[PDB]
From a paper:
Thioredoxins (TRXs) are small oxidoreductases that contribute, in most living organisms, to the control of cellular redox homeostasis. Indeed, they reduce disulfide bonds on numerous proteins involved in several processes, including antioxidant defense mechanisms, photosynthetic carbon metabolism, and protein folding. The redox activity of TRXs relies on the presence of two Cys residues in the conserved Trp-Cys-(Gly/Pro)-Pro-Cys (WC(G/P)PC) active site motif.
In the present study, we deepen the structural features of CrTRXh1, providing the 3D structures of both the reduced form and variants in which catalytic cysteines were mutated. While the subsequent catalytic steps underlying TRX-dependent protein deglutathionylation and denitrosylation are yet undefined, the reduction of protein disulfides implies the formation of a mixed-disulfide bond between the CysN and a Cys on target protein.
Numbering used by the authors: 1 to 110
The structure:
């Protein structure tokens, strides 16, 4: 919900990366899995952050099992993994469900 945009395909991924270029907003992505306890724990915070930073940062969700080709291309091997994209390319990351480090990652780029 909120401002978290669910990515279902490479085409949708590419469209959102292009939108970030046009809007000059960083994109933060949660590469996540439904079966992962840490992922479930932090997904609500990812959503509230998406609302708090609406207008400054774009938030995407990629389920690594439903969009495996995108997650594989992005090198995801543990979940949650957060990436930041700027100008279409990877700029920063965080591996693991750390609420404090996720808040810090978003603030750094907003």
């Amino acid at each position: 919900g909120g401002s978290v945009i669910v990515i279902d395909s490479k085409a949708a991924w590419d469209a959102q990366l292009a939108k970030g270029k046009e809007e000059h907003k960083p994109i933060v992505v949660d590469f996540t899995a439904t079966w992962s306890g840490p992922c479930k724990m932090i997904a609500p915070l990812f959503e509230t952050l998406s609302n708090d930073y609406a207008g400054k940062v774009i938030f995407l969700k990629v389920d690594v099992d439903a969009v495996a080709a995108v997650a594989e291309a992005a090198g995801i091997t543990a979940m949650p993994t957060f990436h930041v994209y700027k100008d279409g390319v990877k700029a920063d990351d965080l591996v693991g469900a750390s609420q404090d480090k996720l808040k810090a990652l978003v603030a750094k780029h907003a």
